[PDB]
Design a protein around this ligand. Structure first.
Ligand code: HEM
Ligand code: HEM
Ligand code: HEM
Ligand code: HEM
Lengths: 113, 113, 113, 113
């Protein structure tokens, strides 16, 4: 198994959510970006990782994409402001990928900056 | 599984080389970037993916890094000019990670643009 | 002239905001999209066109971009949920351009769907 | 004059043809999409911008529309294959608008992808 270590030790933050938008994977790089320990994120709705002023609109965007059945995801290709646990904000770059695994719709977000 | 699909179907090209600098993984995103189908890459040396005019210097950079036993990789942090099989060139963004597994040092390059 | 007619009679909604984020142009295509007649938009702030739940976050995104002096705009590259005057919502496709003229920074949004 | 700069610096390729289907405006974005410098296009028939295997049928479609007097243009609303100067092809999205200016029938094509 080299794929897990590749994402686990990746320099970029990696966030993987399942079909119900729940976090199943959150690597150390991601821990440093957000300010949350992985244990505080696993199993929780992706909502807790979204900035407070985007939480109201975000769920509509995942919903729309899942209902789109399109293998292509072009979203979040720009600079986005990530809100940390302590409330401070930093600018980042996101690379979003829709992932069909175990016969379900997964999303992987690789983050940096 | 979940991790293999996360890199295989990733929007970013993914290239994994083992301890012998041989390409172990090369996703579809990477095939489009370089112009090589996976069959032409897997099992071959990393040098076939390095632009011709940088092939003379690149081996020393990976070697220097492997001998450094450091868990981090600061290199390739900026835009790199990628050269395709047909010779055309495109600018790209690289995210390089050193991956330790089963006692050996691997490298995973995530690419975009 | 030829350029004014090209945007005025364009099948795509066109919205131009000046350096003060005030709407300077709003074509008929845009009136149909939003549900606002031009008289209700021209001279007002861009926020009246931003869905209510995104109004809190949108100002920081334009500001961050203006402070970036970059000629490109990578944002809004994906489907956005537009909110009409009556409150109904429709999904749209945006094409955003930063326009430099007479020493000031303007933004032109071309919309469809 | 903000309308010219808005089309001139637009992210989308912009192609404006006059009553005799001759190109009068061709922006930098359009130069990158087609592979032709603007100087090579101005004054020439739109024909040079049409894929070789569509050149025979295209003229019949503009003809038909001009003879239609309808302010509505629904054509080319899908994905179209654009043929570049070097002959390679890419898929694109077109937004076509019929423009009545200076008392004549103009067409503006905004392109992306
Ligand atoms: C700092 C945190 C994050 C912010 C600020 C953020 C922001 C946004 C915004 C503004 C949109 C709609 C506009 C656009 O597409 O650009 C969006 C869409 C979306 N986001 Fe996020 N996001 C964040 C994290 C995530 C994570 C961790 C995932 C999942 C692993 C995710 C998955 C999605 C999906 C699936 C969409 C819809 C895709 C589309 O736009 O076509 N986001 N996000
Ligand atoms: C488009 C192809 C590529 C180009 C143009 C390229 C270019 C370079 C350059 C210029 C350096 C030294 C300067 C710097 O760090 O910025 C470098 C270092 C390095 N490259 Fe590449 N590279 C390419 C692909 C790869 C791939 C596919 C891997 C492995 C998965 C890789 C692994 C490394 C390593 C380990 C180093 C030394 C690490 C460090 O700088 O700290 N490179 N590369
Ligand atoms: C239906 C209404 C609109 C919605 C829902 C909307 C939504 C958004 C969102 C979610 C972002 C940040 C994430 C991203 O880039 O995808 C954004 C950024 C931005 N928007 Fe809007 N927007 C709307 C209308 C406009 C208009 C009319 C203009 C100006 C003519 C505008 C100018 C900008 C700029 C300059 C940015 C930052 C640029 C960048 O992301 O690089 N937006 N907008
Ligand atoms: C990559 C280049 C282009 C391709 C492949 C292309 C292809 C086509 C095709 C297949 C049709 C007929 C079927 C349909 O309406 O979908 C058409 C119609 C038309 N095209 Fe194009 N076109 C191109 C560029 C342009 C440009 C640059 C203009 C003008 C600024 C233009 C103006 C028109 C007009 C006026 C019609 C008739 C409208 C209608 O279908 O009702 N086309 N084109």
């Amino acid at each position: 198994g080299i794929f897990f270590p590749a994402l686990e030790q990746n320099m970029m933050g990696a966030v993987l959510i399942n079909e119900n938008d729940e976090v199943m994977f959150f690597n150390p790089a991601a821990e440093k970006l957000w300010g949350y320990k992985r244990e505080e994120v696993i199993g929780n709705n992706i909502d807790m990782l979204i900035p407070r002023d985007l939480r109201p609109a975000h769920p509509e965007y995942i919903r729309h994409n899942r209902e789109g059945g399109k293998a292509r995801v072009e979203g979040m290709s720009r600079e986005l402001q990530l809100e940390k646990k302590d409330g401070s904000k930093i600018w980042t770059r996101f690379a979003l990928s829709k992932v069909s695994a175990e016969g379900k719709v997964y999303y992987l977000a690789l983050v940096r900056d």
